[PDB]
Amino acid sequence: MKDHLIHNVHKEEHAHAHNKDYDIPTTENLYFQGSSGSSGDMMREIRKVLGANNCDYEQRERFLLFCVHGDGHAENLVQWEMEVCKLPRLSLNGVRFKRISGTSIAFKNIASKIANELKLSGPSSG
């Protein structure tokens, strides 16, 4: 069971709401929205961002990739896993950012960027 044939199905919808009214918990996890097709593309696209930001990743599970950023040393280094999943409630591939190690500051400052590239929501701390 190997995908030998290519498949490019892009969709474009103009139905959404522009409002800043969300309820985020106090836990240590960030949320984002902005799928680029199917749960698969997510992996491909996402990874693309890392490579661009001199960031490496270690695939663990079919829908699990160990993302990591490296600038110069640990202080700047940051490890986080990105799992791709979809729920009926939100009905939108919810990409959760789990900080395995490193620092919050860098963990966020970088989390905000990745989103920009993946045309993801891009939530901030207000």
CATH at residue 11: 3.30.310.80
Q: Are 106 and 78 in contact (CB under 8 A)?
A: yes
Q: Are 91 and 2 in contact (CB under 8 A)?
A: no
How far, in Å, CA of 30 to CA of 80, rounded?
A: 11
Residue 55 lies in domain: 1-126
How far, in Å, CA of 40 to CA of 90, rounded?
A: 18
Question: Helices marked H in the chain — which ranges?
Answer: 39-52, 104-117
Domains identified in the chain, total number: 1
Maximum alpha-carbon separation in the chain: 47
DSSP classification of residue 34 = -
Q: Which of 14, 27, 22 is nearest to 104 (CA)?
A: 27
DSSP classification of residue 84 = -
Cβ neighbour number for residue 81 with a 10 Å cutoff: 18
